[PDB]
């Protein structure tokens, strides 16, 4: 392919962001999942 | 397909002057100026220094349509006093504030730089 | 176990999506179509 | 090292002078 | 396509930023800390950078015409 | 006399209103008329 | 009688107090500022090739768009009043760019670096695209793979931001007075209080908070006003603020001159 030295960084920030997503998105829902059965 | 050129907003015509003057009959010692190719940065600044004369009694001015870059202006005076001497004597007063304001300006650049 | 959020579901829903796609049956119906339909109709 | 890795109280001592769920990091590939 | 020249709203020059901004993502700054770093304080210019889509990079793949 | 261009390997040639439109050496059926000579000039607004 | 105080001060970015002046003045050097300041900006693209993947017009708003060095500008001449057969050295800069890729692999970057100035008005400072630093790169302008190339020709003129934004020096003017809204020139919406729905202006702390007891001020009128200009690099912020005033004094000197010559 020889891909573009910024696609390919691209790529690393989009693989970055979703690990990052689905670490810190997942513990906001359960976190407000909690309060809401606790209340 | 209809739009007007954009230098038109500046470009003064040929045939079309700069300033045209007609008395207002209505009440006594009033004008009528008509300003071509000026917008509401002169107006505005024209107008307010004027209402600050002593001896004006009434300005105001109007932009009739934003598609067309002209405004017009009214000005009536006290008996003594023609308008037109009020407005060179306005235009004298703001040359001359924006020259001491100049003038403060670079001497306080030149103070801080 | 542990509870299923909201995320986890959107992950399932990722994981239909890359499989399936968005005109999966256009596809499907024209495969069959051409895979035995002719030669049943034949 | 991180900030997880920093005691409770030295966290506590970082006080500006929480994540939300509907805050995105944005993305440019997407997924599909 | 490519990143504008100017902010549409005010015309700060954000076409010289770009490249410096993946190379931040690329440091692992998050972007809002990454438009700090550029001096994009107003949130118009902040949504030109934020908001665009690099589409030349898959225009570019394309075999030229030319040659 | 008029210059072409090949739609698939991108050859320069030339046709003169007799010939098969094809391509001279890789032989594809689609080409394309190459650019004019005339001044182009835009006003950069 | 005005005066002039400045807070902050840089070669794009002056923060500044005026006193002393009407509102009208402030906002019409606003306007004249943003509006009516003349600098110098590609205007005329010839376009010798152009094998990229973007449109010659694409490419020609990009390079109009473009800030150019405008310090010695006042001494070009707009060419519409140039009596010169075509464009001339004292109405016209002309750049020249030329890019290409070389290789089989890779992707070429084309910046405003790469503009070369070929010919101008003799030694005036005006017409090289501005650069923040010696080793920076610029604004991109295009990107070119193998066998790709772009050769343009490209003519700046002057003119103002009034017939194209692109002659614009400023980006953006800030622009506040009253911060604790004593002449009662807003009234504060609001769900319960409007004394802490409603965050503290920046410059709440260079006016005095008003007493309680306090009564209304009828005979009050706005004094003090802060601006801050930014500027896109074409020209400083001291060279814009007094180009500003020169511009406006012109102008009512104008007018002075018309009403005389009325008579
Ligand atoms: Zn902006
Ligand atoms: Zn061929
Ligand atoms: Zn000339």
Known sequence: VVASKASSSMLKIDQRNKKLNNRFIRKAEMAAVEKRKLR | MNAPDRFELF??????????????????????????????????????????????????????????????????????????????????????????????????????? | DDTITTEDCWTVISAFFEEKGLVSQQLDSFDEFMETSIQDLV | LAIENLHPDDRLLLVDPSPVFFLRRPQYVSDG | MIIPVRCFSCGKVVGDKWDAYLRLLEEGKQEGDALDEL????????????????????????????? | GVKYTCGACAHNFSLNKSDPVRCKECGHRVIYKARTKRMIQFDAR | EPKVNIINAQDDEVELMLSDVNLSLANSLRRTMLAEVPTLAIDLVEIKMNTSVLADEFISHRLGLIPLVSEDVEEMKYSRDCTCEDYCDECSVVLEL????????????????????????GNLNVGEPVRRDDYDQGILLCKLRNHQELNIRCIAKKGIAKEHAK????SAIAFEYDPHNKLKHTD??????????????????????????????????????????????????????????????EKLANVLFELENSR
């Not at chain 2, 209505?26 to 002593?54: G, Q, S």
């Not at chain 7, 002659?167 to 400023?170: A, F, L, Q, V, Y």
């Open chain 2, 11 to 113: 470009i003064l015509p040929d045939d079309v002057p700069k300033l045209k003057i007609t008395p207002d009959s209505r009440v006594p010692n009033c004008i009528i100026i008509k300003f071509e190719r000026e917008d509401h940065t002169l107006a505005n600044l024209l107008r307010e220094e004027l209402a600050l004369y002593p001896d004006v009694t009434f300005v105001a001015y109007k932009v009739e349509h934003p598609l067309f870059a002209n405004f017009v202006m009214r000005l009536q005076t006290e008996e003594g006093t023609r308008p037109k001497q009020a407005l060179e004597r306005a235009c004298a007063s703001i040359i001359n504030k924006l020259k001491t304001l100049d003038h403060k300006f670079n001497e306080e650049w030149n103070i801080k730089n």
């Open chain 5, 39 to 67: 001096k994009l304080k107003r949130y118009c210019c902040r949504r030109m950078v934020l908001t665009h889509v690099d589409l030349i990079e898959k225009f570019l793949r394309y075999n030229p015409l030319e040659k």
């Open chain 7, 98 to 121: 030329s890019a290409r890729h070389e290789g089989e692999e890779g992707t070429t970057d084309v910046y405003s670096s790469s503009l070369i100035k070929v010919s101008g008005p």
């Open chain 7, 167 to 170: 002659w614009s020096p400023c």
């Open chain 7, 188 to 249: 504060f919406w609001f769900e319960v209080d409007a004394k802490k729905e409603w965050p503290d202006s920046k410059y709440a702390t260079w006016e005095e908070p008003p007493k309680p007891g306090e009564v209304f001020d009828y005979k009050a009128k706005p004094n003090r006003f802060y601006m801050t200009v930014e500027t896109t690099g074409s020209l400083k912020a001291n060279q814009v603020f007094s180009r500003g005033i020169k511009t406006l004094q």
